[PDB]
């Protein structure tokens, strides 16, 4: 029983820690987009209608 | 004051007249019942105490029980049909004459 819980902990933290650190670094040094009025004559990409950098990356890369 | 038994309250064994009226026939029956139980106890113990046994001691009595166990009606349906139909008829009629109060009712 203790071996399983150590393994469960290890494999969640194996990617959970890099993801936790990655999210903090993105939030600190990249930050969130700031809302702005669509400048006249400009056509934003579909991924420019979202705020968080990870959300924009998900939209651009996959959707 | 005499004890009166019920489905959910059995007669105390000390107040049962039979437990004092004992006969050779009754003792003989008790002895036969003890012999049956002792035979089963010995059969169980010879497996239970076996050093080399690992597993479950299958009890045919348990198997017989589950096999037998695993082997009104519309009245409730009719009753509820008329409770809900009668309730929904009344409510529907009120809604159509504006009597029912649905001032803030916008979630459904």
């Amino acid at each position: 029983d203790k071996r399983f819980l150590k393994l469960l902990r290890f494999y969640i933290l194996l990617t959970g820690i890099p993801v936790a650190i990655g999210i903090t670094l993105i939030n600190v040094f990249i930050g969130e987009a700031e809302l702005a009025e669509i400048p006249e004559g400009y056509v934003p990409e579909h991924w420019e209608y979202f705020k968080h950098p990870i959300s924009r990356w998900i939209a651009r890369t996959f959707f | 004051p005499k004890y009166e038994a019920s489905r959910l309250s059995s007669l105390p064994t000390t107040l049962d007249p039979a437990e004092y009226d004992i006969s050779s026939e009754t003792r003989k029956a008790q002895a036969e019942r003890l012999a049956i139980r002792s035979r089963l106890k010995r059969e169980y113990q010879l497996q239970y105490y076996d050093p080399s046994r690992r597993g479950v001691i299958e009890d045919p009595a348990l198997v017989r029980w589950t096999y037998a166990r695993s082997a009104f009606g519309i009245g409730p349906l009719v009753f509820w049909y008329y409770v809900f139909k009668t309730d929904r008829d009344r409510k529907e009629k009120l809604i159509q004459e504006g009597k029912l109060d649905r001032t803030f009712n916008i979630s459904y």
Binding site: - | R7, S9, S10, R64, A71
Partner: protein, 155 residues
């Protein structure tokens, strides 16, 4: 286990009774099937309708928490009669007297509460008085509609 050792149809002739009784590890005198109605008991024995709590707790049962011995026939409703569920043990007070006393108490209380509502206690005082037309605006009254004033005097 074999079909001969499993439960069967309702026994007809006495010879099937003897075979059924030996199958269930009972003596022929004790064996008694359920009524041959339409339920579907078969030849499964009808045993006393007693909870497992009534069995002797000091005996060395093969199943102490169930108070059952290995190989002993199980009551049809054993799962209803386990010690966690329906108890049928003798009670110091007769069952019928318990019911009458309990119902009599609840009925009397419900009656007296009805009487207490119809003749309520209260102190010898007039209604509590509030200013500004019984707080018409504070209670949410319409400010555009003029309220018919309420007046309170000294005494």
């Amino acid at each position: 286990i074999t079909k001969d050792m499993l439960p069967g149809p309702y026994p007809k002739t006495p010879e099937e009774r003897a075979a059924a009784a030996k199958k269930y590890n009972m003596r022929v005198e004790d064996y008694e099937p359920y009524p041959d109605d339409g339920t579907g008991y078969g030849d499964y024995p009808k045993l006393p309708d007693r909870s497992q709590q009534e069995r002797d707790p000091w005996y060395d049962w093969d199943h102490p928490d169930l108070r059952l011995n290995w190989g002993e026939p199980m009551h049809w409703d054993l799962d209803m009669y386990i010690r966690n569920r329906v108890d049928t043990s003798p009670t110091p007070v007769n069952w019928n007297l318990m019911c009458k006393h309990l119902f009599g108490f609840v009925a009397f209380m419900l009656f007296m509460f009805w009487v207490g509502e119809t003749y309520p206690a209260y102190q010898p005082v007039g209604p509590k008085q509030y200013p500004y037309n019984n707080l018409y605006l504070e209670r949410g009254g319409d400010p555009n509609k003029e309220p018919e004033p309420v007046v309170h005097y000294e005494i």
